[PDB]
Symmetry: C3
């Protein structure tokens, strides 16, 4: 699975080890080995939520399987909690797009996961 | 709805109030409450369109519904117009990917829209 | 077709002519004219793959058609080949999400490709 976070929160406001924490937390949440987890944090972004420039975040979680109604509700609770605690972003100013990818549409190591 | 614009146009060329204008126009165009509109602009990017480094833009518009043949054409007319007028980018050097998201695949406020 | 690569490799490590090479190779690979190919490279990113901060890349290839099991495997060999040779990124530290887009869902030149 791969998780990306785009936020207007300053770089200096991103705690050391945040990437490591995301990796471990996602490994547990998805049940996938951490070796397969990819995390990407993009701070200092020019963005707005509801017209406001208050702290916010636009995220995405791509996974081959492990995506569904209940699971996504669970991932959101987890991720919003992490963003609220580590970056001080209000959960109601966070959007997380979930993508259930087909193995044939994910390239890796010169081939695909098909 | 969430709109993202990646462009090689410099930061200084993005006019004040641009994010604000995008939010309103999208609110109007989508028929969605302004408070739920998210906008993200990423200037100074290393990109090419048709092999050329002249001003260009790669964008995305995600929305739960309100995505379709006629609606997308209307959004494109609107958004290319804004990019041409505000960022001086030719409409024929702009790509906009539209995504009709399922409510269950959009996280927000510790849960999802399902 | 549009290709985006996000990587923690530094900007100085991206060789001159990289965007042009991607443009040409993707035109050759997809069979589409180079005039339609868009490429975007984002270096110096804050990311981890498998819990490690060694060179890695998170990419996406969007295309109207020309996406499939065998074609995607071919694109992955080509793109990982380029990332390894030009950016010194190990193929097993690269993810490429492939998206087969409907023409009606791709905006360009004030309208869509429908
Ligand atoms: O392991 N995860 C692999 C993976 C799953 C889904 C993606 O979009 C990219 C990469
Ligand atoms: C044909 O040219 N490619 C168009 C195109 C295809 C897919 C996209 O996501 C954006 C633009």
């Amino acid at each position: 699975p791969m998780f990306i976070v785009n936020t207007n929160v300053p770089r200096a406001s991103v705690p050391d080890g945040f990437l490591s924490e995301l990796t471990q937390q996602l490994a547990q949440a998805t049940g996938k080995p951490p070796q397969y987890i990819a995390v990407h944090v993009v701070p200092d972004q020019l963005m707005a939520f509801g017209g406001s420039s208050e702290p916010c975040a636009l995220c995405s979680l791509h996974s081959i399987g492990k995506i569904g109604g209940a699971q996504n509700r669970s991932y959101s609770k987890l991720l919003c909690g992490l963003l609220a605690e580590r970056l001080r972003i209000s959960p109601d100013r966070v959007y997380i797009n979930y993508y259930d990818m087909n193995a044939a549409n994910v390239g890796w190591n010169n081939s695909t996961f098909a």
